[PDB]
Design a protein around this ligand. Structure first.
Ligand SMILES: [Ca+2]
Ligand SMILES: [Ca+2]
Ligand SMILES: [Ca+2]
Ligand SMILES: [Ca+2]
Ligand SMILES: [Ca+2]
Length: 146
């Protein structure tokens, strides 16, 4: 077990958007066509680095198996990032992108933890990198995964 016929069909449809000429491979040129359509104009060197990250056999192009492997893993990545984003936006009660001590304390009380200002201040100091006494999303992620 691994993938349904419907999952493979949608991966194949995604691959086809890149594989302009239908030869079963994605070249640097084709990847460039797609990004250019999206508003980015990478150089050949930048495109090569992108292919090199996903071209497992080193033949210079990305085939469908290589694209399935990298995509399926990107979607695990994305599912874990979404979980940290949702957790953050809850802590960040006013939506300003900074969890304050007051916000952290309120949400911790709802999570069943009645903490003092000093306790909360220590939690933030542990995670605070830029020294503003607040936790931004990078600081939050960094702490949560490490
Ligand atoms: Ca092609
Ligand atoms: Ca560039
Ligand atoms: Ca390859
Ligand atoms: Ca806030
Ligand atoms: Ca901070």
């Amino acid at each position: 077990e691994q993938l349904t016929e419907e999952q493979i069909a949608e991966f194949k449809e995604a691959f086809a958007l890149f594989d302009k000429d239908g030869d079963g491979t994605i070249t640097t040129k084709e990847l460039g066509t797609v990004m250019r359509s999206l508003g980015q104009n990478p150089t050949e060197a930048e495109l090569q680095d992108m292919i090199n990250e996903v071209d497992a056999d080193g033949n210079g192009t990305i085939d469908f198996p290589e694209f399935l492997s990298l995509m399926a893993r990107k979607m695990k990545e994305q599912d874990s990032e979404e979980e940290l984003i949702e957790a953050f936006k809850v802590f960040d009660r006013d939506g300003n992108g900074l969890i304050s001590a007051a916000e952290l304390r309120h949400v911790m009380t709802n999570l069943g933890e009645k903490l003092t200002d000093d306790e909360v201040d220590e939690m933030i100091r542990e995670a605070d990198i830029d020294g503003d006494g607040h936790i931004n999303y990078e600081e939050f992620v960094r702490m949560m995964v490490s």
